[PDB]
Amino acid sequence: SRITKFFQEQPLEGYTLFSHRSAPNGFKVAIVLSELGFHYNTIFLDFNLGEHRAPEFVSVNPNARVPALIDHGMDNLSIWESGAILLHLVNKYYKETGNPLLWSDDLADQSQINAWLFFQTSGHAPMIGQALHFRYFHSQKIASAVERYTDEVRRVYGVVEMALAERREALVMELDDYPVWLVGDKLTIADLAFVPWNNVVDRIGINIKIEFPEVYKWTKHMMRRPAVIKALRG
Template sequence: MSHGKQFTLYAHRTAVNGYKVAIVLSELGLEYEMIYLDFDKKEHKAPEFVKYNPNGRIPALVDHANNDFVLWESNAILLYLVHRYDKGHNISAFTDADKALQDQWLFFQASGQGPYYGQWAWFVSAPEKIPLAIERYKKETERVLSVLDTVLTGQKWLVGDKMTIADISFIPWNDLAFHRILGPDYPLGETFPAMFKWHTAMMSHPAVKTNMEKRAELLKSA
């Protein structure tokens, strides 16, 4: 294999979805090179990247050990990684029932958390403020947090008795929401105590901590 690392991960310095993939790669002990695309230069729309992802979005992953297999859509990448490289099910579900629940949460994250948090972040930072849109996506973000809090009030993890990719998939967007969207004055721990405890527990994992600290440092210079 001519590549120095097994994987090439195309991402962005501060955009969140690449970091969930980086966390899973790190959790599985897989070696990867993270290439940051410059959105201002439209590198994510350039032919050199669109050949990997025709949607022109990050992340995209190239598995050099599997004939340079390419995959995009972050949660599809997580499923690929655990199906192929997590034979011991360290961060993935084992039983058929738990696998179905894991998929359920991955779909919820992709269809609920990501779009709503993303739209709220966009409208909050847009030059022209549209109060109706800001209020709608704020409420939807709080609804997603409420769903997580309700479920996690009765259990420690979303699936089974350990952290899986179902949990990991929520980390980067939650981290962004807590620090950039909701703001430091939002009573997060009081409003969503079970969800906040869950997120805090995940942030203590070395692979999570390292990657989210890396993003925080890059964000300072953005």
């Protein structure tokens, strides 16, 4: 119940992120939070000890999963889906600064950023997770179950590879080595959403460097950002 006295002496501002020592989506939030200059604490829940089931946390996330963010400045508001957390932060930053960092002020761009973000949260991370389960933690070894998801994850990367290849070509058509991005030729939460999961697909047999060139470049560009590096220290 260590979490108890936490919700009885909550900070005045800043943020508290609840995650797991190596949760790819928890890394998603750490990245964005850092990239936006917000100050945050990080509480790693030991799932093996069922700390994600403690009533004081299921009140912070009925789904009892990580990550979860407590925006202290906003009356200790609890945002609990990695996707909702990114939108909250970029919206929070835009409102305070007037600068759409990792976001956009244009509505069309916003819908595009969301399209890719939802694609990441619902079509990318879940499939990789299933590939992981069947290859390492399922009660039985079924190759078709593994192939199903590794195939789907590879299809997903094919979609992004294609998209980036298109942004690349358009840029190259500026004939008179640069980073390419999913939306509005600028880095956004749509690009950052994939990074943490990108760095883990090798564990399901996918080598991005060889299989998806543009994704390799795109992901390399993101891993070289100090803000991403600072947060990725496990």
